[PDB]
Design an enzyme around this catalytic site. Structure first.
Site, PDB file in Angstrom:
ATOM      1  N   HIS A  73       0.840  -1.199   0.000  1.00 44.11           N
ATOM      2  CA  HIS A  73       0.000   0.000   0.000  1.00 44.11           C
ATOM      3  C   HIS A  73       0.877   1.252   0.000  1.00 44.11           C
ATOM      4  O   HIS A  73       0.956   2.013   0.967  1.00 44.11           O
ATOM      5  CB  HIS A  73      -0.959  -0.029   1.179  1.00 44.11           C
ATOM      6  CG  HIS A  73      -2.019  -1.074   1.047  1.00 44.11           C
ATOM      7  ND1 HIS A  73      -2.069  -2.195   1.849  1.00 44.11           N
ATOM      8  CD2 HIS A  73      -3.050  -1.186   0.179  1.00 44.11           C
ATOM      9  CE1 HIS A  73      -3.098  -2.942   1.491  1.00 44.11           C
ATOM     10  NE2 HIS A  73      -3.710  -2.352   0.479  1.00 44.11           N
ATOM     11  N   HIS A  77       1.188   1.205  -5.905  1.00 45.85           N
ATOM     12  CA  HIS A  77      -0.171   0.676  -5.955  1.00 45.85           C
ATOM     13  C   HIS A  77      -1.170   1.765  -6.321  1.00 45.85           C
ATOM     14  O   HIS A  77      -2.080   1.538  -7.127  1.00 45.85           O
ATOM     15  CB  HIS A  77      -0.526   0.043  -4.610  1.00 45.85           C
ATOM     16  CG  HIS A  77      -1.967  -0.341  -4.478  1.00 45.85           C
ATOM     17  ND1 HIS A  77      -2.506  -1.445  -5.102  1.00 45.85           N
ATOM     18  CD2 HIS A  77      -2.979   0.228  -3.780  1.00 45.85           C
ATOM     19  CE1 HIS A  77      -3.788  -1.538  -4.798  1.00 45.85           C
ATOM     20  NE2 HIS A  77      -4.101  -0.535  -3.998  1.00 45.85           N
ATOM     21  N   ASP A 114      -5.642   5.054  -1.051  1.00 50.78           N
ATOM     22  CA  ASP A 114      -4.909   4.376   0.016  1.00 50.78           C
ATOM     23  C   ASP A 114      -3.882   5.285   0.685  1.00 50.78           C
ATOM     24  O   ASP A 114      -2.933   4.783   1.295  1.00 50.78           O
ATOM     25  CB  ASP A 114      -4.203   3.120  -0.505  1.00 50.78           C
ATOM     26  CG  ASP A 114      -5.112   1.911  -0.561  1.00 50.78           C
ATOM     27  OD1 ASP A 114      -6.056   1.825   0.255  1.00 50.78           O
ATOM     28  OD2 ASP A 114      -4.871   1.037  -1.419  1.00 50.78           O
ATOM     29  N   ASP A 231      -8.606  -1.852  -7.958  1.00 48.53           N
ATOM     30  CA  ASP A 231      -7.911  -2.172  -6.716  1.00 48.53           C
ATOM     31  C   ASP A 231      -7.551  -3.652  -6.655  1.00 48.53           C
ATOM     32  O   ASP A 231      -6.465  -4.018  -6.189  1.00 48.53           O
ATOM     33  CB  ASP A 231      -8.797  -1.776  -5.534  1.00 48.53           C
ATOM     34  CG  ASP A 231      -8.033  -1.659  -4.232  1.00 48.53           C
ATOM     35  OD1 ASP A 231      -6.852  -1.258  -4.258  1.00 48.53           O
ATOM     36  OD2 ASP A 231      -8.627  -1.957  -3.175  1.00 48.53           O
ATOM     37  N   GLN A 282      -3.263 -17.051  -3.253  1.00 47.64           N
ATOM     38  CA  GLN A 282      -3.601 -16.409  -4.522  1.00 47.64           C
ATOM     39  C   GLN A 282      -4.727 -17.145  -5.237  1.00 47.64           C
ATOM     40  O   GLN A 282      -5.601 -16.511  -5.840  1.00 47.64           O
ATOM     41  CB  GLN A 282      -2.368 -16.320  -5.422  1.00 47.64           C
ATOM     42  CG  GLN A 282      -1.403 -15.208  -5.049  1.00 47.64           C
ATOM     43  CD  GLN A 282      -2.098 -13.875  -4.839  1.00 47.64           C
ATOM     44  OE1 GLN A 282      -2.830 -13.393  -5.706  1.00 47.64           O
ATOM     45  NE2 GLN A 282      -1.875 -13.274  -3.677  1.00 47.64           N
ATOM     46  N   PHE A 285      -7.877 -16.269  -3.271  1.00 53.30           N
ATOM     47  CA  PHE A 285      -8.149 -14.873  -3.603  1.00 53.30           C
ATOM     48  C   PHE A 285      -8.779 -14.746  -4.984  1.00 53.30           C
ATOM     49  O   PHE A 285      -9.739 -13.990  -5.173  1.00 53.30           O
ATOM     50  CB  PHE A 285      -6.835 -14.089  -3.511  1.00 53.30           C
ATOM     51  CG  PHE A 285      -6.951 -12.616  -3.793  1.00 53.30           C
ATOM     52  CD1 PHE A 285      -7.902 -11.831  -3.162  1.00 53.30           C
ATOM     53  CD2 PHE A 285      -6.049 -12.006  -4.651  1.00 53.30           C
ATOM     54  CE1 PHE A 285      -7.974 -10.468  -3.417  1.00 53.30           C
ATOM     55  CE2 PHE A 285      -6.113 -10.651  -4.907  1.00 53.30           C
ATOM     56  CZ  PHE A 285      -7.076  -9.880  -4.289  1.00 53.30           C
TER      57      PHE A 285
HETATM   58  C1  LIG Z   1      -2.886 -12.359  -0.670  1.00 53.83           C
HETATM   59  C2  LIG Z   1      -4.285 -12.196  -1.266  1.00 53.83           C
HETATM   60  N1  LIG Z   1      -4.758 -10.783  -1.329  1.00 53.83           N
HETATM   61  C3  LIG Z   1      -5.707 -10.384  -0.463  1.00 53.83           C
HETATM   62  O1  LIG Z   1      -6.110 -11.223   0.344  1.00 53.83           O
HETATM   63  C4  LIG Z   1      -6.157  -9.055  -0.454  1.00 53.83           C
HETATM   64  C5  LIG Z   1      -5.702  -8.207  -1.458  1.00 53.83           C
HETATM   65  C6  LIG Z   1      -4.697  -8.626  -2.322  1.00 53.83           C
HETATM   66  C7  LIG Z   1      -4.166  -7.766  -3.275  1.00 53.83           C
HETATM   67  C8  LIG Z   1      -3.191  -8.250  -4.138  1.00 53.83           C
HETATM   68  C9  LIG Z   1      -2.775  -9.572  -4.031  1.00 53.83           C
HETATM   69  C10 LIG Z   1      -1.800 -10.065  -4.892  1.00 53.83           C
HETATM   70  N2  LIG Z   1      -3.310 -10.378  -3.103  1.00 53.83           N
HETATM   71  C11 LIG Z   1      -4.252  -9.943  -2.250  1.00 53.83           C
HETATM   72  O2  LIG Z   1      -6.103  -6.891  -1.517  1.00 53.83           O
HETATM   73  C12 LIG Z   1      -7.021  -6.375  -0.499  1.00 53.83           C
HETATM   74  C13 LIG Z   1      -6.200  -6.084   0.778  1.00 53.83           C
HETATM   75  C14 LIG Z   1      -7.264  -4.975  -1.069  1.00 53.83           C
HETATM   76  C15 LIG Z   1      -6.026  -4.157  -1.392  1.00 53.83           C
HETATM   77  N3  LIG Z   1      -6.243  -2.848  -1.321  1.00 53.83           N
HETATM   78  O3  LIG Z   1      -5.131  -2.077  -1.607  1.00 53.83           O
HETATM   79  C16 LIG Z   1      -8.009  -7.391  -0.240  1.00 53.83           C
HETATM   80  C17 LIG Z   1      -7.221  -8.598   0.359  1.00 53.83           C
HETATM   81  C18 LIG Z   1      -8.272  -9.508   0.537  1.00 53.83           C
HETATM   82  C19 LIG Z   1      -9.061  -9.860   1.795  1.00 53.83           C
HETATM   83  C20 LIG Z   1      -8.726  -9.341   3.191  1.00 53.83           C
HETATM   84  C21 LIG Z   1     -10.168 -10.903   1.610  1.00 53.83           C
HETATM   85 MG   LIG Z   2      -7.592   0.369   0.586  1.00 56.33          MG
HETATM   86 ZN   LIG Z   3      -5.894  -0.248  -2.611  1.00 63.92          ZN
END
Ligand SMILES: CCn1c(=O)c2c(c3ccc(C)nc31)O[C@@](C)(C/C=N/O)C[C@H]2C=C(C)C
Ligand SMILES: [Mg+2]
Ligand SMILES: [Zn+2]
Ligand SMILES: CCn1c(=O)c2c(c3ccc(C)nc31)O[C@@](C)(C/C=N/O)C[C@H]2C=C(C)C
Ligand SMILES: [Mg+2]
Ligand SMILES: [Zn+2]
Lengths: 323, 323
Positions: A73, A77, A114, A231, A282, A285
């Protein structure tokens, strides 16, 4: 000499822009240079009478409030979400469908969405009785803060890039930006997605292919989901980009879970470097968050997201094969 | 005079307690003495192991952060809403419904619900680009602030009145207090009233005649509307009390309107001292806000609140008669 950076920036409208190079080449100023570029590219400097010195002053002040020692962050990003949103605004199935103001709102929102992120989740700030969660009563703690910082910096000297908007334009923009950035809170993802599906099944289109939204409620919901897609766009980018995003978010998560392990808290999902699988995280996700969201977006803008959805499903297959 | 104050505090269980006398007889400490009295009445100090001097120190500090120079939104309003909530909690139709922790939450929320109120509305803070509106992104600007200040003051020396609650207790109490105070934002009133209507229409009761509340959502909604009723309870009080509240809200409104007319802003409804009708605004306030709410609440707890609704209707008639 700069033609390196200027020639990379040539890709500003293409998904998979070389954002890590642009960061290195720009002097760790990817947010400033990419925003500057994107405003020219859509001519927002003259459409809204923005002194260029005022834009650069604000952008650099904004970029400075992203934390250089936070692995994910940070200003890269922000730059990547800005540029991502910028492409998704130029999709055929949505062209000329948003104002110059709605366009300005979505891109400004992406830039600030962010800012001043401390590298820890809303849940961490809540559980640790942080000053942030105390200020914001545990609700969209970070997202409220990013907005407040993003707007506050406009008041620094020569930073008011909206000085020549009409006052109701400023009010309209302010409200749209807030609605958009508050929508980046992951606790809102589920309801935001169901609403997107709803709009997709009762959708309406023109003969050339462009989408039909009649009321603010639906259009801001699209801009919300748009920046929300930007995002969560990392797994849709080319794999050499996606992999660097995975390294960074996991570094940040692990750096958080260490602090939860001193403090004696339950270590958050994916933050325990001693038991997490980076690759399985991943795939989950993608399976549970990114692909449900991007499939629905692809419908809304069908045909337009197929190359993006293509890359996402390839990248999913690859990460699965590493397990 | 301590004798006289102590006598007046014997009425703490009654609607129309003379809160203004108690403000004078307590040396402008109505919130402290009424809260202390109520905590003793309900035995909350033993139930939650609250040290008496901790309670007094917090109450005194919280009372200080109400503005003595704001005619309505001050410590007297706070003590009145606390005491009104205290009576509403004791209604027969709710006997044994709420836990000690929920009772604690509603009384505490009433006590903090307007702390540090500057005497101007949310819309005024939004329109004048205040620091508060900027911090809270134009959403429940004051109510968020009241919560932040009220919780923050617990961390001052010898002020944590919740120091002996379990962790689960503090977490649950905190969420309930936030839910309740955010419900005092009048922009939420219509939806909150619509929910209370539905609940009355679908109301369920135990074999004991007491209201049956299955789940957090119904429980917090009743507590939300309870404190909101207490917040809007001035027109239900004996006329000599009601009239002094009208004097105070109208003085505070007029001063905001002066600030508005100074700034070349449109003057908010009821804030223009050259063109306001004090009497018509009270009739409109009752007809469109207070009676629709208190009529629904009376239905929820029927017949418990008949006398209070009768009083509201008499006072409405009285103000009407003066036109
Ligand atoms: C490791 C997996 N992963 C995430 O888990 C999250 C990511 C994210 C972004 C990129 C990658 C590669 N991986 C990510 O992003 C969130 C934190 C949103 C990011 N905002 O900046 C959302 C978060 C998800 C939640 C808490 C369910
Ligand atoms: Mg955010
Ligand atoms: Zn973000
Ligand atoms: C002049 C009439 N009047 C009000 O208009 C309001 C009162 C209020 C309280 C007492 C009396 C006597 N009169 C009141 O209270 C609100 C500001 C809520 C109070 N919170 O402390 C809500 C406000 C209503 C709005 C903005 C529709
Ligand atoms: Mg209030
Ligand atoms: Zn109040």
């Amino acid at each position: 000499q700069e033609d390196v950076l200027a020639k990379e920036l040539e890709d500003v409208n293409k998904w998979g822009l070389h954002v890590f190079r642009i960061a290195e080449l720009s002097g760790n100023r990817p947010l400033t240079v990419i925003m500057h570029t994107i405003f020219q590219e859509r001519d927002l400097l003259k459409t809204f009478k923005i002194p260029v010195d005022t834009l650069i002053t604000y952008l650099m002040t904004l970029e400075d409030h992203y934390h250089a020692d936070v692995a994910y962050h940070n200003n890269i990003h922000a730059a990547d979400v800005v540029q991502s949103t910028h492409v998704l605004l130029s999709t055929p199935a949505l062209e000329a469908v948003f104002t110059d103001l709605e366009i300005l709102a979505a891109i400004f929102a992406s830039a600030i969405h962010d800012v001043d992120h401390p590298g820890v989740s809303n849940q961490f700030l809540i559980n640790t009785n942080s000053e942030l969660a105390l200020m914001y009563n545990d609700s969209s703690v970070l997202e409220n803060h990013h907005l407040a910082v993003g707007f506050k910096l406009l008041q620094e000297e020569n930073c008011d890039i909206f000085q020549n908007l009409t006052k109701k334009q400023r009010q309209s923009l302010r409200k749209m930006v807030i609605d958009i950035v508050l929508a980046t809170d992951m606790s809102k993802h589920m309801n935001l997605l169901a609403d997107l599906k709803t709009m997709v099944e009762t959708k309406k289109v023109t003969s050339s292919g462009v989408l039909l939204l009649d009321n603010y409620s639906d259009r801001i919901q699209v801009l919300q989901n748009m920046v929300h897609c930007a995002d969560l766009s990392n797994p849709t980018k080319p794999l050499q980009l996606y992999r660097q995003w995975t390294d960074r978010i996991m570094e940040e998560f692990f750096r958080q879970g260490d602090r939860e392990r001193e403090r004696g808290m339950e270590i958050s999902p994916m933050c325990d470097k001693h038991n997490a699988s980076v690759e399985k995280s991943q795939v989950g996700f993608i399976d549970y968050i990114v692909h449900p969201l991007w499939e629905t977006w692809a419908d809304l803008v069908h045909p337009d997201a197929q190359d993006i959805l293509d890359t996402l499903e390839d990248n999913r297959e690859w990460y699965q094969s590493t397990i």
